[PDB]
């Protein structure tokens, strides 16, 4: 099974400079080219750089928006990508994703990595507040309130419960993030079981269980 | 450079029908040596990673269904969709890789569906903010269309709000969409009456949810 997993993502002021990397397993490393793509929130996807497979010498490309400042690697031994970001500004603010790219017979970009988020800014790192969302169907909710930088993750009832799940996108006011979730579940399940949210705000560490209490 | 163009920007289908999108790049993608057109679609769903659809212009990628058909060469490319299903919202994004890589803009494709009243909530303020001196008001308009929605807040009887409406559901593909409505703890206390009034084009009569503080 192809994997690709990016991680490095978070917070860094304008000017510093961030390390991604991407682990993969489940395919020959070294046969294949491998690519860095980004997209800022709400926009279209840009190509960063390739670099080349074994039987190309390892040999890297870069788009001219990113040549001289940001450098891709590879460590062949533990099939781990890398992509070096110098001299960072605003418009770095993207999911990086790494795919899989050539492998000098296919052109494609087979399999993709789920994206790490940069944040470029110079805002402290805030964590959220949770809040719960308590009144044949019940609605039930958690409010995240004032946190930054993206992202959080929202699950409910440690994800067993994933269906009539939506997460409403955060939206941004004087420096911080809030967003909110609901879940709509049968009233005969609810408060005589359990639903909880579970809310995680990686740039803090923060995880939070909030159970719905009536 | 190598420069790709995309249209339309945006489109929506009922489900069932055709979807037909475009792509081209500024010289052609016709490889003389392959005798191949190097231009790959990819499929964007909401808050998911790309996915490959097809390349080479129109080979489609082992598990993609048939109603996915890539065609064109050189310099204009197409994507058609037959039978579009509900799951098939996403942003489409074609990629050359004759000369490193360009993706073009993307064209996202929305879901038409019959029109869905909402359905209203309102949440107090939790005893968990509240102590903390503030006070947020909480009102979800959940699975409802068309996107358009209005909605108001009346406190005691008259008219710091935040709007978010989610992505399209890529199963029942509806939307929804949460407004909240934050006070300091010393101003929510002053009034009794906390109503949100959401007006959708499915009903004349606003859709209205109502708590009062004395009865909490
Ligand atoms: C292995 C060489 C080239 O592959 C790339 C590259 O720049 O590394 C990557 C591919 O995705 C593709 O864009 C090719 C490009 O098509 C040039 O490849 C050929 C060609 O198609 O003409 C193929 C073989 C040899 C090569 C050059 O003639 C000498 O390296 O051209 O580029
Ligand atoms: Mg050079
Ligand atoms: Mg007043
Ligand atoms: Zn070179
Ligand atoms: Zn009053």
């Known amino acids: 099974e192809v994997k690709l997993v990016e991680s490095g993502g978070g917070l860094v002021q304008s000017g510093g400079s961030l390390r991604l990397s991407c682990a993969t397993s489940?395919?020959?490393?070294?046969?294949?080219?491998m690519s860095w793509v980004r997209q800022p929130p709400g926009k279209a996807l840009e190509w960063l750089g390739f670099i080349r497979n074994k039987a190309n010498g390892y040999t890297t490309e870069y788009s001219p928006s990113v040549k001289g400042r940001f450098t891709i690697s590879r460590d062949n031994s533990q099939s781990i990508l890398y992509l070096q970001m110098n001299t960072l500004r605003a418009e770095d603010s993207a999911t990086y994703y790494c795919?899989?790219?050539?492998?000098?017979?296919?052109?494609?970009?087979?399999?993709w990595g789920q994206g790490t988020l940069v944040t470029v800014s110079a805002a402290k790192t805030t964590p959220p507040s949770v809040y719960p969302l308590a009144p044949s169907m019940v609605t039930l909710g958690c409010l995240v309130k004032g946190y930054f930088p993206e992202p959080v993750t929202v699950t409910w009832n440690s994800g067993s419960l994933s269906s009539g799940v939506h997460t409403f996108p955060a939206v941004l006011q004087s420096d911080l993030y809030t967003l909110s979730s609901s879940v709509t579940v049968p009233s005969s399940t609810w408060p005589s079981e359990t639903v909880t949210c579970n809310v995680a705000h990686p740039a803090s560490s923060t995880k939070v269980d909030k159970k719905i209490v009536p | 450079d190598i420069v790709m163009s995309q249209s339309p920007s945006s489109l929506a289908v009922s489900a069932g029908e055709k979807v037909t999108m475009s792509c081209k790049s500024s010289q052609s993608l016709l490889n003389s040596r392959t005798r191949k057109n190097y231009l790959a679609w990819y499929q964007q769903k909401p808050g998911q990673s790309p996915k490959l659809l097809i390349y080479?212009?129109?080979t489609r990628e082992s598990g993609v269904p048939d109603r996915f058909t890539g065609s064109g060469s050189g310099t204009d490319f197409t994507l058609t969709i037959t039978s579009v299903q509900a799951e098939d919202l996403a942003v489409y994004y074609c990629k050359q890789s004759y000369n490193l890589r360009t993706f073009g803009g993307g064209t996202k494709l929305e879901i038409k569906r019959a029109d869905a009243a909402p359905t209203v909530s309102i949440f107090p303020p939790s005893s968990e903010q509240l102590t903390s001196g503030g006070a947020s008001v909480v009102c979800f308009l959940n699975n409802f269309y068309p996107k358009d929605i209005n909605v108001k807040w009346k406190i005691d009887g008259s008219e710091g709000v935040l709007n978010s409406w989610t992505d399209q559901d890529s199963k029942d593909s509806t939307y929804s969409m949460s407004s909240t409505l934050t006070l300091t703890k010393d101003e929510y206390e002053r009034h009794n009456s906390y109503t949100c009034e959401a007006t959708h084009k499915t009903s004349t009569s606003p859709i209205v949810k109502s708590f009062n503080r004395n009865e909490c």
């Open positions: 489940g395919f020959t490393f070294t046969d294949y080219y």
């Open positions: 080479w212009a129109s």
């Open positions: 795919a899989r790219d050539h492998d000098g017979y296919y052109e494609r970009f087979s399999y």
